[PDB]
């Protein structure tokens, strides 16, 4: 649950992402894959990537980064009223991709890391607080659907 002022911070930060969605999406996935190499094994189309240089050179990884952040941005713009947008993603990630909630924690922290890396000194403590709360809400509502499905 976020206040109006917190949502305003989230959507202000998101403007930074929308200026370069592919570059942000690429770096988020690279941070996930290099920090948590077990996550790469869930992607049949990226498991061939052995080095970060190959990851950086992969145009399909940048494409998928655009898909991921476009979906997340659509959810964030609903300011919590995201049941219709979130349900299909919860279902596909639990039942088809088999993504444990832990990996959603990993990618949430990766987003925070990338924002500081690309905007050092321009991602203030209030903005980090609000973005963190928004990603916690996203993860918590996914977790509720995971529990319904019995997925661990």
Annotated binding site for nitrite: 64
Six-digit token pair at 43?
């992607």
Binding residues for O2: 64
SS percent in the chain: helix, strand, coil, step 5: 75, 0, 25
Smallest gap from Cβ 44 to ligand HEM, in A, equals: 6
* CA nearest to 53, candidates 26, 76, 25, 90: 26
Considering only residues 91 to 130 of the shown chain, the ones binding ligand HEM according to CB under 6 A are: 92-93, 97, 99, 103-104, 107
Asked if 72 is part of the footprint of ligand HEM (rule: CB under 6 A), the reply reads yes
Smallest gap from Cβ 146 to ligand HEM, in A, equals: 13
Considering only residues 13, 21, 89, 114, which one is a binding residue for ligand HEM as defined by CB under 6 A? 89
- For 142, other C-beta atoms within 10 Å of its C-beta total 20
Smallest gap from Cβ 128 to ligand HEM, in A, equals: 17
Q: Which run of H or of E encompasses 59?
A: helix 59-76
Asked if 133 is part of the footprint of ligand HEM (rule: CB under 6 A), the reply reads no
Q: Which is nearer to ligand HEM, 31 or 93 (CB)?
A: 93
Smallest gap from Cβ 71 to ligand HEM, in A, equals: 4
For residues 91 and 97, give the distance between their C-alpha atoms in angstroms, rounded to a whole number.
9
For residues 102 and 124, give the distance between their C-alpha atoms in angstroms, rounded to a whole number.
26
Binding site for ligand HEM (CB under 6 A): 39, 42-45, 67-68, 71-72, 89, 92-93, 97, 99, 103-104, 107
């Amino acid at each position: 649950g976020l206040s109006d002022g917190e949502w305003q911070q989230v959507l202000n930060v998101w403007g930074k992402v929308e200026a370069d969605i592919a570059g942000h999406g690429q770096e988020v996935l690279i941070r996930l894959f290099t920090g948590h190499p077990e996550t790469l094994e869930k992607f049949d189309k990226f498991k061939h990537l052995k080095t970060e240089a190959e990851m950086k050179a992969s145009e399909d990884l940048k494409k998928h980064g655009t898909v991921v952040l476009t979906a997340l941005g659509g959810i964030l713009k609903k300011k919590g009223h995201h049941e219709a947008e979130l349900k299909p993603l919860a279902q596909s990630h639990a039942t088809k991709h088999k993504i444990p909630i832990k990996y959603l924690e990993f990618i949430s922290d990766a987003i925070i890391h990338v924002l500081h890396s690309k905007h050092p000194g321009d991602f203030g403590a209030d903005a980090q607080g609000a973005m963190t709360k928004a990603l916690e809400l996203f993860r918590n509502d996914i977790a509720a659907k995971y529990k319904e499905l019995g997925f661990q």
